Structures are given as C-alpha cells and as structure tokens.
C-alpha cells in the first residue's frame, strides 16, 4: 500500500480523538472573522482541527513532525490571542498533549511509514534526481512562451476569486520548493503536481483561454524532457528505490 495513505489515516484518527476531548469546540473550525472581529488582525497563520483534517486529506504531512507543527499552531495562536495561561490555551494544550501521547503510543509503526514516505538523508541518487528535475522545470518548462502566469503562486490582489475556486493551487515555484526538499522519489510523484497546474487552469481559465493552451505546452515540454532523460531517470529511480527498500527491511 501507499504508506502515505496509511500515515494519513492514523493522523485523521488522532484528529477525531482531539475533536472529542471535552470543551475543545472553539478549535473545531476556523474562527469566524465576522464574529471575533479582531482575530485575523493578530493571528497571521490560523489553524483549526477542520483545516488540519483537510491538510491530511491533501497528503500534506509526510511525517509526525510536520503534522505536529501545524497542530502546535493551535496552541501558539491561542496563547498569543487569548493569553498564555488563559483557559482555552490550556484546552488547546490538552489536544497537543493527547496527540503527543498517541504519536509515541504508535511510535514504531509511524517511524516505518515515515521511512517509506520520505527521501533518504544524504542519498547521492536522490540529490542527483532532484537536481535533474529542477532543470527540466526551469530551463525547459519555464521557457515555454508566455508561461509566466504559472511561474509563481497567484497573487490574490490580481485574481481575487482564485483561492475560492481552486481547492489545490499549484505553480512551478512550489514544485521547485518540493524539489529542494527531495519530495519526489519517482517521476510519478513529480508529474502529478505538474498536471495539476493544467487541471487548475482548465478549472479556472477553461479551454476557452490561451493561458490554458500554454498550460498544456508546459505539460508537454515536461513529458518530452522526461523521456529524453528516461534511461538515466529509470536507473536513478531504481537506485533510490532499492536503497529505500533496504532501509525498510533493516
Ligand atoms: C492566468 C491566471 C489564472 O490562473 C492561473 C494563474 N493566473 C495569474 C497568475 C499571475 C501571477 S501573479 O499573481 O503573482 C502577478 C505577477 C503579480 C502568478 C504570476 N497573474 C495573473 C494576472 C491576472 C490579471 C492581471 N490583470 C491586470 S494587471 N490588469 C490591469 C488593467 O488592465 C494581471 C495578472 N494571473
């Protein structure tokens, strides 16, 4: 199976357990700014259990620690807004304490899943594979004529109605951010995010736009360059893959 699917289900069940701790209701959904009118003029990175759950379902957390990092925002934001010793900051700390409890309670299964999901540290093949990708994206995919609208995340001041329509933004710069963290062990993982930039454009611009026409030329220039390095990428994928499965048996 996908260990990431397995890891996500374990995180989701921890979210359910945290949602069912008593008096946690203020943290279940994002703060209604029309109610708590000053909340978002103080809290710059809000977090809540519903947003936490959504991020799990978007496969955003490949390990215990990045999950725990967003969950700890809930505690930190309460300590900033309500106060460090306020009763709700204690209720939020109660959720984080329950999460730490069950993360260590299932520690060795989680560590094996993390080994299967994440890149191997100081791997020569993984370094080389990521390096190839950040030259397909820049020297080719970013070289498509009039590709610039997809080089970066959309600025909400220029397309105000974008993030209210696109569940999963994706651009060529966040791909590069993923490449530098060695997210992509295979070509499978990499091309999913690439085709999403095209799927996003058809969902927003539609096939009645030139921007959508350029969005697939970015996709096509990607597949061509990948086949162009296919013999070298396959060996890189095999070497990464075999170095990985050795870390899992051991
Ligand atoms: C194609 C759409 C649809 O989905 C995919 C992405 N997207 C984008 C993406 C972007 C950028 S950006 O946001 O960072 C921008 C650079 C600061 C990502 C690079 N810019 C824009 C855009 C939209 C409208 C205008 N119009 C103006 S300035 N009119 C002035 C009066 O004539 C300008 C630009 N659209």
From Swiss-Prot:
Changing residue 53 to H: In MRXS33; uncertain significance. It comes from the Eukaryota. Residues 1-250 are annotated as: Interaction with ASF1A and ASF1B. Residues 1-106, 120-229 form the Bromo domain. Phosphorylated by casein kinase II in vitro. It is found in: Nucleus. Changing residue 118 to H: In MRXS33; uncertain significance. The TFIID basal transcription factor complex plays a major role in the initiation of RNA polymerase II (Pol II)-dependent transcription. TFIID recognizes and binds promoters with or without a TATA box via its subunit TBP, a TATA-box-binding protein, and promotes assembly of the pre-initiation complex (PIC). The TFIID complex consists of TBP and TBP-associated factors (TAFs), including TAF1, TAF2, TAF3, TAF4, TAF5, TAF6, TAF7, TAF8, TAF9, TAF10, TAF11, TAF12 and TAF13. TAF1 is the largest component and core scaffold of the TFIID complex, involved in nucleating complex assembly. Component of the TFIID basal transcription factor complex, composed of TATA-box-binding protein TBP, and a number of TBP-associated factors (TAFs), including TAF1, TAF2, TAF3, TAF4, TAF5, TAF6, TAF7, TAF8, TAF9, TAF10, TAF11, TAF12 and TAF13. Interacts with TAF7; the interaction is direct. TAF1, when part of the TFIID complex, interacts with C-terminus of TP53. It is linked to Dystonia 3, torsion, X-linked: An X-linked dystonia-parkinsonism disorder. Dystonia is defined by the presence of sustained involuntary muscle contractions, often leading to abnormal postures. DYT3 is characterized by severe progressive torsion dystonia followed by parkinsonism. It has a well-defined pathology of extensive neuronal loss and mosaic gliosis in the striatum (caudate nucleus and putamen) which appears to resemble that in Huntington disease. Belongs to the TAF1 family. The Bromo domain mediates interaction with histones that have acetylated lysine residues at specific positions. The second domain also recognizes and binds histones that are butyrylated and crotonylated. This is Transcription initiation factor TFIID subunit 1. It comes from Homo sapiens. The lineage of its organism: Eukaryota, Metazoa, Chordata, Craniata, Vertebrata. The chain holds residues 1400 to 1649 of 1893 of the full protein.
């Amino acid at each position: 199976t996908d260990p990431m699917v397995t890891l996500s289900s374990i995180l989701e069940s921890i979210i359910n357990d945290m949602r069912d701790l008593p008096n946690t209701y203020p943290f279940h959904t994002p703060v209604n700014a029309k109610v708590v009118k000053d909340y978002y003029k103080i809290i710059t990175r809000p977090m809540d259990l519903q947003t936490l759950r959504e991020n799990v379902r978007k496969r955003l957390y490949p390990s215990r620690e990045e999950f725990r990092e967003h969950l700890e925002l809930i505690v930190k934001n309460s300590a900033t807004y309500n106060g460090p010793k306020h009763s709700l900051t204690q209720i939020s700390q109660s959720m984080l304490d329950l999460c730490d409890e069950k993360l260590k309670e299932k520690e060795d299964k989680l560590a094996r899943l993390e080994k299967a999901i994440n890149p191997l540290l100081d791997d020569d093949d993984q370094v080389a594979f990521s390096f190839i990708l950040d030259n397909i994206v820049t020297q080719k995919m970013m070289a498509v004529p009039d590709s610039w609208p997809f080089h970066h995340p959309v600025n909400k001041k220029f397309v105000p109605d974008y993030y209210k329509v696109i569940v999963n933004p994706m651009d060529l710069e966040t791909i590069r951010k993923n490449i530098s963290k060695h997210k992509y062990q295979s070509r499978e993982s990499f091309l999913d995010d690439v085709n999403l930039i095209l799927a996003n454009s058809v969902k927003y611009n539609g096939p009645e736009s030139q921007y959508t026409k350029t969005a697939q030329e970015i996709v096509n220039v990607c597949y061509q360059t990948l086949t162009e390095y296919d013999e070298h990428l396959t060996q890189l994928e095999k070497d990464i893959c075999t170095a990985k499965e050795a870390a899992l048996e051991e």
